[PDB]
Design an enzyme around this catalytic site. Structure first.
Site, PDB file in Angstrom:
ATOM      1  N   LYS A   1      -3.995  10.391  -3.733  1.00 56.81           N
ATOM      2  CA  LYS A   1      -2.575  11.229  -2.949  1.00 56.81           C
ATOM      3  C   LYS A   1      -1.779  12.016  -4.208  1.00 56.81           C
ATOM      4  O   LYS A   1      -1.127  13.041  -3.446  1.00 56.81           O
ATOM      5  CB  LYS A   1      -1.835   9.979  -2.541  1.00 56.81           C
TER       6      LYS A   1
ATOM      7  N   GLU B   1       8.129  10.477   4.620  1.00 57.31           N
ATOM      8  CA  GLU B   1       7.883   9.437   5.603  1.00 57.31           C
ATOM      9  C   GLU B   1       6.752   8.394   5.097  1.00 57.31           C
ATOM     10  O   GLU B   1       5.894   9.100   4.608  1.00 57.31           O
ATOM     11  CB  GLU B   1       7.829   9.605   6.914  1.00 57.31           C
TER      12      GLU B   1
ATOM     13  N   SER C   1     -11.389   6.675  -3.188  1.00 58.18           N
ATOM     14  CA  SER C   1     -10.230   7.277  -3.121  1.00 58.18           C
ATOM     15  C   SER C   1      -9.006   6.477  -3.782  1.00 58.18           C
ATOM     16  O   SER C   1      -7.936   7.007  -3.974  1.00 58.18           O
ATOM     17  CB  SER C   1      -9.865   7.389  -1.703  1.00 58.18           C
TER      18      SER C   1
HETATM   19  C1  PLP Z   1      -3.430   7.366   2.064  1.00 64.75           C
HETATM   20  C2  PLP Z   1      -5.049   6.415   1.517  1.00 64.75           C
HETATM   21  C3  PLP Z   1      -6.335   7.043   2.298  1.00 64.75           C
HETATM   22  C4  PLP Z   1      -6.176   7.248   3.760  1.00 64.75           C
HETATM   23  O1  PLP Z   1      -5.822   8.720   4.233  1.00 64.75           O
HETATM   24  P1  PLP Z   1      -6.784   9.906   4.026  1.00 64.75           P
HETATM   25  O2  PLP Z   1      -5.440  10.880   4.216  1.00 64.75           O
HETATM   26  O3  PLP Z   1      -7.525   9.932   5.096  1.00 64.75           O
HETATM   27  O4  PLP Z   1      -7.151  10.545   2.705  1.00 64.75           O
HETATM   28  C5  PLP Z   1      -7.444   6.767   1.634  1.00 64.75           C
HETATM   29  N1  PLP Z   1      -7.398   5.997   0.516  1.00 64.75           N
HETATM   30  C6  PLP Z   1      -6.540   5.355  -0.317  1.00 64.75           C
HETATM   31  C7  PLP Z   1      -6.816   4.627  -1.509  1.00 64.75           C
HETATM   32  C8  PLP Z   1      -5.227   5.890   0.115  1.00 64.75           C
HETATM   33  O5  PLP Z   1      -4.141   5.335  -0.334  1.00 64.75           O
END
Ligand code: PLP
Ligand code: IGP
Ligand code: IGP
Ligand code: PLP
Ligand code: K
Ligand code: K
Lengths: 389, 249, 389, 249
Positions: free
Chosen positions: C85, C107, C375
């Protein structure tokens, strides 16, 4: 021994005879390892590709605005695990493997060392058993679960005594008979030699990177490097490479707790007296008649009753200076870093930042290039601070 | 120093082995502890190994650590221990008295001053559990200056160099190889590996050791009969006389 | 517009007329920014020295042992904030500053985007106000506190509707009148153009680094790159640089929740139908008569009722493939990664790993070089998993 | 289309302005909604702007969003809304009826099919709140094919190009500059900026607009008198006749 176990009058190997072979075995392996390019390459690969080194050195302009102080934070909070602990736990793990060992023995308080032992062991295929005292367990429940998830065997010890120093007894007792196949993973630059030396050498990359990074950014070495001192690992990791740079001030920050004068603190180096315990001769929190006392601090990661031998020594010769920071001062540095730089520092590292802020604020027109070792992140502390606020 | 020589010499003339029980000073209470000790002595104990409650018993497992807890719950201090030691010595002039210490309580107000206090109360030896031969110098030199016997542990993983060191450094007795120890003229060896049955005492002597030390076994009896002080002593007497009989010839 | 708002039939700018000027303003600034070397250098400095890029690419040998699969994890969990993010939130923040704006509007649901908006704003001196629905707040209390600590103004919205899509209404309404001085910070590669494009460009470094890193380690591109798809940001960030590398498979993983057939899932791209909402035309979770429905997943970070326009498009032409992973499958991948590699993955990333494990396990003798975009970290999820276990 | 021309022409001959009240279909209930609408009509409303409950009201603030909640709590569906629209049209042949829609409910089962359904029930115009002139093509072309007037909002931040587009694309009325709009021959402008008092209606007309639209004010009255259905209608009648009187000459 192959190396000097003492740092002046401090250090040594004050352990039962039965444990000397384990210590001499470890010292010998460490020495081989350090000479071994292959070990260094493997250790380096892990730190780089698994832990995420080199960590960044963040220039914090917002907090030093309006003063002549330039502050940089060594981002150990960005290291895999969220704390500097990983570096030496990875090194010790490779060392146990070098010695053909399959098990890892550890003990915990704040939970961070137990979790760190657990991540390294899981990663390197080592059976890890962690000792923890009941009283300490219930409090560190999240970390307890983390350790289990990582396959670590958290052994519940409860016999009156149920704290770090009290749980160490069972960890050592085990190692006494298991040292042939198990390695005791000590979490700080303390205990009997060669631990104070091994942990420093396995944490010194923090300081080596900082030096290169500061030279890259500012083209000069810092005026001072500041690090909190629980047992001394993150601090010695930062200091190590700068010791021969006499122009660079080394400042270690001990927990003042509710305030030195209240007695409820964890600053033995400057407000305790040399004793013998934890397998070493070093300053400690003890009663008039020699009974070891407990340290106090808002941050559990700094509740060690003693300090590393090398720190007590660096102080005696006037090479490094040590000071204290109250819970309140640490809490203020914590909140200040959040709001001005968007970084949630661990309550431990907040003691080091709080001091840097003091150096700045007391003398706003003093030009000084400072580096604070941000040893970990404070995600774990938001609830604590939350309850105080 | 002296008392050990006298004891081992006498035991030798009797082709008898030494039985040394271990107990924590002040466990389960000061008054209760003095009684326990007198009962051990008059039951057949040849020497005594007494520990002073230390806040962090490194080289200690469950049974012994619990004993310290009990002593501490009773508020036992090192100061109170030395007062007990004087009284015990005042009642029994010849029985060798050894102390199981942890480095900090010895080092606290000066190593030499600790040994002087030992000599003053009539202690004969001191085994500092967390001081290996490699760090013993100031401890042994101080013990010697004060006519105290510095006891060293000879572990199972011990090698030649250690055997030679323990032999030249130790006095009184060697806390336990046996043939090598006698070769180097070490102090009479006393085996301390979980000795809890009479058969173990005779076996220890047969192997060539001068005697055996039993700690946890004694502590167990105390821990077992806390609510019954009289039954505690009674059982302690029976255990000791049995173990002592097994060393006798 | 300056750029194409559509990806095939998907995308567009379905917002009230009043908001078009704000969108065209942002698109124009983004275009200038991308041409501006100084903006790129500033954005790069932040990512490097503040966030900790480039993140590592970890080869996981333990989990793929005994199979012909070679798995690598892109370590976005090691990024400042613990999630990918940060990258795009930093970029959008510099963009608001480029437009002379001083406020940031956002938000939140899972809390991660709110916290991310808060860290970037605090760092760059921006006044940040975050909208959050009551029901959502109480659940994400830790993140709520984190946002406040970082100076963010968490505005409590509660009027029947109290979720992300329901809270967006107030965030947009605000921006309608504040766009002159405020920038609405959208957290995923969705919404009205130019957001789907901006977020991708500000996340594409994930894929660019992975390509370089995979070429360094293996000397070849991966057979497939796998990423979970909540809104599509981490996924498009990974995919972007590999789109023209036709030999590289792109696999997006949607939350199957309790199982597709149960209806309780969050996989609109493959199990929903095109609609118009969130300012875009894209596949979504909706009733037969057009009322938007809620997505379901063990992981809150994947509870978006729709998907990015570019993903729906990449699917239509057969360039990227999308699949689903159940809560149970995600939980298994979570535990497996912990025990075998000592890495606590976010429940979101666990869906992407769970699929990689499936590809491996179903065809153990298939030689394949895979990269899973990790992610974020799962420290936040230990309690959830804890309660299930 | 047709009905608007007829209304504005008549109002023109009377030097009178148009007052158009907004209400959510099915709020607070279907039966209750039909009553409210008849009361608005027979109180003086010149046209009507009706919204169908959508799950995600993007361009809506507090008052209006709460209205949808109430309609949804009553289980109001788009299907039920079109049934209501037919009944309203069956009772009032000439009053123009406009719909406030969100793109998804229009697009759901085919844009063209939506407009066909509008024509079938007797709806005169449709304003799709979340469709800017830049995305209006398929919506406006479909509206036209079905004799429905595609209404466009002319914002305060509107520029020339937008003014020209809204002028050529819109039919029926322009949801509101005024002089430029007439220059481009736009449909009669109807101001909708928080019109809640009679003074605002006269002011709107004086500025050159053909009338005013009041939404939240009407909704407020409903939200205010939920527990008193009869007082709700009574107050709704008084509010409407007051606002209508202010447009009259
Ligand atoms: C916010 C989040 C996502 C889900 O959203 P995307 O917009 O698809 O990337 C994926 N992995 C993590 C660890 C997150 O915090
Ligand atoms: O309990 P055992 O196995 O019977 O051994 C006596 C032992 O407890 C006692 O001598 C002792 C007490 N503390 C020690 C520390 C180290 C070595 C020996 C000891
Ligand atoms: O409430 P007001 O300020 O009196 O304006 C009527 C308005 O609510 C109504 O026409 C409407 C309902 N939804 C909308 C969406 C966009 C624009 C306008 C509307
Ligand atoms: C374990 C810990 C420390 C305290 O110990 P040291 O051994 O002094 O380094 C400091 N900071 C963090 C964030 C920790 O987790
Ligand atoms: K300390
Ligand atoms: K989704």
């Amino acid at each position: 021994t192959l190396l000097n176990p003492y740092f002046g009058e401090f250090g040594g190997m004050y352990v039962p005879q039965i444990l000397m072979p384990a210590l001499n075995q470890l010292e010998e392996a460490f020495v081989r390892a350090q000479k071994d390019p292959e070990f260094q390459a493997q250790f380096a690969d892990l730190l780089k590709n698994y832990a995420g080194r080199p960590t960044a050195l963040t220039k914090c302009q917002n907090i030093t605005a309006g003063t002549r102080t330039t502050l940089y934070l060594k981002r150990e909070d960005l290291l895999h695990g969220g704390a500097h602990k990983t570096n030496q736990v990875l090194g010790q793990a490779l060392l146990a493997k070098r010695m053909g060992k399959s098990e890892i023995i550890a003990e915990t308080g704040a939970g961070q060392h137990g979790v760190a032992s657990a991540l390294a062991s899981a990663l390197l295929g080592l059976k890890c058993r962690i000792y923890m005292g009941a009283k300490d367990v219930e409090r560190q429940s999240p970390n307890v679960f983390r350790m289990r998830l990582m396959g670590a065997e958290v052994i519940p010890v409860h016999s009156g005594s149920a704290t770090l120093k009290d749980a160490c007894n069972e960890a050592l007792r085990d190692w006494s008979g298991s040292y042939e196949t198990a390695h005791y993973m000590l979490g700080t630059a303390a205990g009997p030699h060669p631990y104070p030396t091994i942990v420093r050498e396995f944490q010194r990359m923090i300081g080596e990177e900082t030096k290169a990074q500061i030279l890259d950014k500012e083209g000069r070495l810092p005026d001072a490097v500041i690090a909190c001192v629980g047992g001394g690992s993150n601090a010695i990791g930062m200091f190590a490479d700068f010791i021969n740079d006499t122009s660079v001030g080394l400042i270690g920050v001990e927990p003042g707790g509710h305030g030195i004068e209240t007695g409820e603190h964890g600053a033995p180096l400057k407000h305790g007296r040399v004793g013998i315990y934890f397998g070493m001769k070093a300053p400690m929190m003890q009663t008039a008649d020699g009974q070891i006392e407990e340290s106090y601090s808002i941050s559990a990661g700094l509740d060690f009753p003693s300090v590393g031998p090398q720190h007590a020594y660096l102080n005696s010769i006037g090479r490094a200076d040590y000071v204290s920071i109250t819970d309140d001062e640490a809490l203020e540095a914590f909140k200040t870093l959040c709001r001005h730089e968007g970084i949630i520092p661990a309550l431990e590292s907040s003691h080091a930042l709080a001091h840097a802020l003091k150096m700045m604020r007391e003398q706003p027109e003093k030009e000084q290039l400072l580096v604070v070792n941000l040893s970990g992140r404070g995600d774990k502390d938001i609830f604590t601070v939350h309850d105080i606020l | 120093m002296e008392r050990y020589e006298n004891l081992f010499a006498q035991l030798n003339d009797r082709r008898e082995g030494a039985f040394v029980p271990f107990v924590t000073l002040g466990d389960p209470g000061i008054e209760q502890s003095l009684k326990i000790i007198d009962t051990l002595i008059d039951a057949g104990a040849d020497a005594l190994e007494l520990g002073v409650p230390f806040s962090d018993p490194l080289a200690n497992g469950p049974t012994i650590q619990n004993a310290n807890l009990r002593a501490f719950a009773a508020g036992v201090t090192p100061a109170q221990c030395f007062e007990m030691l004087a009284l015990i010595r005042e009642k029994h002039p010849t029985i060798p008295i050894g102390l199981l210490m942890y480095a900090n309580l010895v080092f606290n107000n000066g190593i030499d001053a600790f040994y002087a206090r030992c000599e003053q109360v009539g202690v004969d030896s001191v085994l500092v559990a967390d001081v290996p031969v490699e760090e013993s110098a100031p401890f042994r030199q101080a013990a010697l200056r004060h006519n105290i016997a510095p006891i060293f542990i000879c572990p199972p993983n011990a090698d030649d160099d250690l055997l030679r060191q323990v032999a030249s450094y130790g006095r009184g007795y060697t806390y336990l190889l046996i043939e090598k120890l006698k070769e180097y003229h070490a102090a009479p060896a006393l085996q301390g590996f979980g000795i809890s049955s009479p058969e173990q005492v005779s076996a220890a002597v047969r192997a060539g050791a001068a005697g055996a030390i039993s700690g946890s076994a004694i502590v167990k009896i105390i821990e077992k009969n806390l609510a019954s002080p009289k039954q505690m002593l009674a059982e302690l007497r029976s255990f000791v006389s049995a173990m002592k009989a097994a060393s006798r010839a």
